[PDB]
Amino acid sequence: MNAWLQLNTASEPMLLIPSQALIDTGSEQRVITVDADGRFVPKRVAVFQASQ
């Protein structure tokens, strides 16, 4: 018989965000932070790895 084996592996704690909120131009990755006054401000981040 066949059997599918799905695994889940924990990884070293890093800053986590919904993947949809991560822009990428291939040379820089950024997100759009929401200030205290609602002001939308962008910032660069260094990605580690994504999944799920």
Binding site: D24, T25, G26, S27
Partner: protein
Amino acid sequence: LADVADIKVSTGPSMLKTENARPTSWIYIDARDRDMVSVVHDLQKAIAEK
């Protein structure tokens, strides 16, 4: 797949406008309040100087 290749994200051409073989970009302007010629003339100054 990463055992027979790399995969890298890039930024490049979205669509090549080819007017008479020469690549070109169009700038769409929507002014309705003023009169046409007065706007374009003012656009001709702003662009010329800056």
